[PDB]
Paper text:
TAP is a heteromeric ATP-binding cassette (ABC) transporter comprising two subunits, TAP1 and TAP2. In this study, we analyzed the structure of TAP in the presence and absence of peptides.
We created an 8-mer modified b27 peptide (b27′) lacking the central lysine at position five, and two 7-mer modified b27 peptides, each lacking the lysine as well as the adjacent glutamine (b27″) or serine [b27″(Q)]. The 8-mer B27′ increased the ATPase activity of TAP to a slightly greater extend compared to b27. Structural analysis revealed that the N and C termini of b27′ bind to TAP using the same interactions as b27. Intriguingly, the arrangement of the TM helices is more similar to the a2- and c4-bound structures than the b27-bound structure. Consequently, the lateral opening seen in the b27-bound structure is no longer present, and the ER luminal gate is entirely closed. NBD separation is greatest in the apo structure (53 Å), and reduced in the presence of peptides to between 35 Å (for the 14-mer peptide) and 27 Å (for the 8-mer peptide). The shortest distance we observed between the N- and C-binding pockets was 25 Å in the 8-mer peptide-bound structure. This suggests that a minimum of eight residues is required for a fully extended peptide to be effectively engaged by both binding pockets and initiate high-affinity binding and subsequent transport into the ER lumen.
Numbering used by the authors:
A (entry chain C): 1 to 8
B (entry chain A): 182 to 270, 291 to 483, 492 to 742
C (entry chain B): 131 to 479, 483 to 680
Write the structure that this text describes.
Amino acid sequence: RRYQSTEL
Amino acid sequence: SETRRLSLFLVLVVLSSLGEMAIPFFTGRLTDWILQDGSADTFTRNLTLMSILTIASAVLEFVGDGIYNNTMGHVHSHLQGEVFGAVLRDTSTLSDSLSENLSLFLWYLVRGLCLLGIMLWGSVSLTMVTLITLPLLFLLPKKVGKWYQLLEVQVRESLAKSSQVAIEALSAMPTVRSFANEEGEAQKFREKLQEIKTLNQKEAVAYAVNSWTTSISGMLLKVGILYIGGQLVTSGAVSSGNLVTFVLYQMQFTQAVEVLLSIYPRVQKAVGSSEKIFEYLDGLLTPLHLEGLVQFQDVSFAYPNRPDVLVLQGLTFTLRPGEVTALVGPNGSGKSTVAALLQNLYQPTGGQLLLDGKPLPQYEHRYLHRQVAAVGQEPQVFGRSLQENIAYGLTQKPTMEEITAAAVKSGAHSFISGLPQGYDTEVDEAGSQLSGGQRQAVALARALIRKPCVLILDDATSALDANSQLQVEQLLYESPERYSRSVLLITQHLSLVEQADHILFLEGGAIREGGTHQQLMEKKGCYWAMVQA
Amino acid sequence: QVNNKVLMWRLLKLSRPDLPLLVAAFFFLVLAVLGETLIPHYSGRVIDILGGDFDPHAFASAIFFMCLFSFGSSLSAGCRGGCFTYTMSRINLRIREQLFSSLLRQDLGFFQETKTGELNSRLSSDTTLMSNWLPLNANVLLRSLVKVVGLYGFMLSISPRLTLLSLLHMPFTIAAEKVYNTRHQEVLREIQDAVARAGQVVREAVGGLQTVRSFGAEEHEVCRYKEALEQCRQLYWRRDLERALYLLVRRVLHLGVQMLMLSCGLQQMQDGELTQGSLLSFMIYQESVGSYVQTLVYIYGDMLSNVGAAEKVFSYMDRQPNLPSPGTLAPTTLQGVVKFQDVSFAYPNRPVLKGLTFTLRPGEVTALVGPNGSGKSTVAALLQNLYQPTGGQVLLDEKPISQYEHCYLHSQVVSVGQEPVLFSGSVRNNIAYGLQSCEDDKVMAAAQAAHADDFIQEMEHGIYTDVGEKGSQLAAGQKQRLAIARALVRDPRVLILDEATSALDVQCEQALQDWNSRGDRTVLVIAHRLQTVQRAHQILVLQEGKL
């Protein structure tokens, strides 16, 4: 598993 | 206990990282082979190694994740079940967030360590840039992160406070309209909104500063290694293919370390919030016949809130079979406490007691709870069906004919049949399915279905209707088999106490009257005061 | 759809008062995306410089452009986030204030029929989702939709066939991401449903704790909770297995494009067309493009949920109240006569009130008694203009009560409920509630007149001490005393007391039956016993909603 997220 | 799978998961993660490492090293060496003008055998072998190593890595990663799951879920379920069992005698979000963050931290930590290891496989000089710029990558963003987190949590707390105030006004709305003070509540909301607006500018400044620091540190490192590697390639000690590998290595290492910085405070918060939950975590003889009788000998009890101060003393009543005992007077006499002690809710603080020739803890807990069932202070109906609500706590499920017979004995059979689908009707939670008298009848039926040895039913008909009280008194006076199981009437209706064989009364933590009801009236004690009232 | 279009138009109209922040953030966004697109091409330029003959001028120029574009892309990305989160907070605060202001003025029946948690979810959690549309999701969608086209310009600028490979590769990734996101959303819905079921189980178990402990049924409830937890764990395992399988197939397809792209690029290398730095830059661009496509798809998926939340919130502020406008009547002098005539009231959910007719006087103490299923309070509720009578009308000084000023009527006609409610403030605030600014001397004068100063003078700073939330720190006698003090401090003309002899001491009744503001003011008292019959000047009765 890989981390993924969005920034403002 | 799960280490036998956790060690396998860890070695699976390590091997998956090694296999995943195949893309940049092999593509750099392959471009170096292009510059070397070698034969196609090396190119084909390197492509095959690429594909095989990374497909093994992907399969190994999937297997390791599937092994970490089905195990962490089991641990979470067991922990939540144990916590619920402990509180019986709020967490799941903490548990699965902690699991997710812990596994992400482990994955990216192993990935970064593997990255650095294969850096050290290559030229040591290009690694030196990473090993000096790592403390600058770690210390400063960790400094800014706590500031940003503090401002964010302050903003969230203020938002929660404002929403709480608004919902309080919304709940109190009829009074607000009575006083015509809508604009006052609007101003009160607006002031808190102004405070939130004041804090948010600092929050935005902290967010911008944190983003600036992280981006500038990472991509300054990315340009620094490129400059150093260009200088060394000019020096000739390092092939250009190694530089090609090192560029992608820096991108992957920067992503891994940024994930680590974004993840670690969440892990710290999760373990900090889980430590308090971990702190919050903290045989008898079986009768085989009728109990017959139970008695106490000047027993004393104390409230759990103040165990140093006794609640009552002088319990000498004996549950004679074929007879009905009585208890009435002030509520401070411990009549509810005496009822709880009769149900073996707590050990007595003094004196002695017996039940079927043995103390209450001597008898088995299941047998004691099945033979000394009693109606509560207020009737309560569970959210299950009535056929299920009238059989709560049964060790084995009996036939529905027995349930119907018990409901007819308590008179609740007609009320149950009035509901659709008979006694199998779903009952609303907290006794919302029917009236309070119906709930009291259901409680009486549940008590009767257990076939108790010593009924301690009380405080049911006192809070119920007059017709329900009359039906309960008629059922109590019409108990078959020479009244069969004895009773202890501690209700507020003194009219039903006329049939008591050995009546009694208590006042101020001790007994004050007893004997026949006519003798109690002819006395000069608390019973005489109640009779004259 | 048209509803989504008008909802997004309303969201833009709400975001309109923050135009300068929007344009500044957009400008910084473009400045960030330009440098972020431009950097890897210069990296390939650096590699190409190193591959051939050594040119110190070209190397120095390339490194300088690295430093400049790096500082520009690092600086321009940070300011955009700060501006966008400031815009987020401004939108959230504005929508919270507007929603509360529109919720305040609605009728009482709307709050009667709607649970408090339903309003709390809209006001607290959903107002966060108001500000996720333009500041965050639209920004991320725009930056993805511009950087994808920029990266596709560059790759074409590198070599066309390698771009045709990407064009062939993308649709499978798009379809896989769509399918995975739909399944993940469905499983998340199932997860929260099962979590709610487990919460209901534990709430039911803890609600009847005394009953369960008496019956000894803790083991059965523990087993039921274990069953619910097993269901939740199985659902969690299904979700995580699906996610891991999606990741595995994604990486497999990633190499399935990567290896063949490397092979074709090296064939072009050996043909003598491309160089090493160009191939490296193409590799970086390929690594970025897929991730940008997936995050674009995910954000466009989140769009619809945010729009649905917007519709859910705007349904409240679009709810039309059913109360007539006030006539703004406010006479300087009021006799205080109140007359009922053949009135009828119906609850929104049944003739609860029917055919009531009476007339009150200033100097006459009037009492109304009668159980009628404890529905006697509806007379006072109708008198306070809280509800609109279905038939007849209620008149003050031969004038309907609707035409009176909303502030003046409730500053003139004051009633006290059966259960007094406090507002978690100071005693100074909770006694002079409903008043903008009045002297404190009258406040503790009324407090002394209401037999409430006993627990006030014993507490620090007198009336400025703090009480518990909803008044829960104090007891019922203090509730009645505070309610009487609040009613007296406003100096009313028509005073209504409920359960005076049922929930309050006779000292309060004696004070409210002999006060200077109660000697000659119109008083209507409701009691559940005959204790007020002996002192009432006139007594009226009602049963089953009729006289």
